[PDB]
Predict the structure of Poliovirus receptor-related protein 2.
Amino acid sequence: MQDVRVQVLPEVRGQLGGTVELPCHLLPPVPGLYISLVTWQRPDAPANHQNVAAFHPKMGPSFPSPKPGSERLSFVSAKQSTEAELQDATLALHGLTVEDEGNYTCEFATFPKGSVRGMTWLRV
Amino acid sequence: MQDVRVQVLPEVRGQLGGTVELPCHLLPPVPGLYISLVTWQRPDAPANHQNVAAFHPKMGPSFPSPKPGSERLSFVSAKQSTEAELQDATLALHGLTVEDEGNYTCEFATFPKGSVRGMTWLRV
């Protein structure tokens, strides 16, 4: 089986007050490869605020942290299930504030290949 | 729902030629927490070899890297569905080699809480 890798931008410049997207995609599509979960983290947050977004192929989205929080986050293209489509894990952040800045990591938990991640610096 | 984290040993001394176990548990138990995948990684390896083992609740184990490889790795207690039990992700390496030494990370991809990981240094 072909290996998969995460494609993200190394830096995204966001406009304060507005909306910004953090593109994230798993490539290439590979037969026999399942995406079990997608997660976004802010690795520089305190541990209980590091997981900021997760998307499960049956259960859909969860935004477990207050920062940036549920009301301002969305998965632009992730679809629950026959076959769920999680290869585009692009995240959007509305009402962008200075407190939203910093590193974000997009990770795909896949089987059988395991977990793969990419990192983006959101600069404001 | 309580916050979770990963319990591992900081360091493990292993018997060259023999078997070593790297314990890993997700704690505390929390009802309604779904464990989507467990993975073990060697973050210092080249990315084709970083993911060394994975366990999916329906699909069972996989050993994506040829090194250590499936012939030498097993999950000691993880069980696949019926109810999967992935909260104990303890990994056994068999026929331990010098090339196996280094940093190991055990990660749980969970929903709704996201991903959490603990690290163990394997030495001789």
In short: The first strand of chain A starts at residue 5 and ends at 8. Chain A has one domain: 1-124. The domain at 1-124 of chain A is CATH 2.60.40.10 (Immunoglobulin-like). Chain A touches chain B through 27 residues (CB under 8 Å).
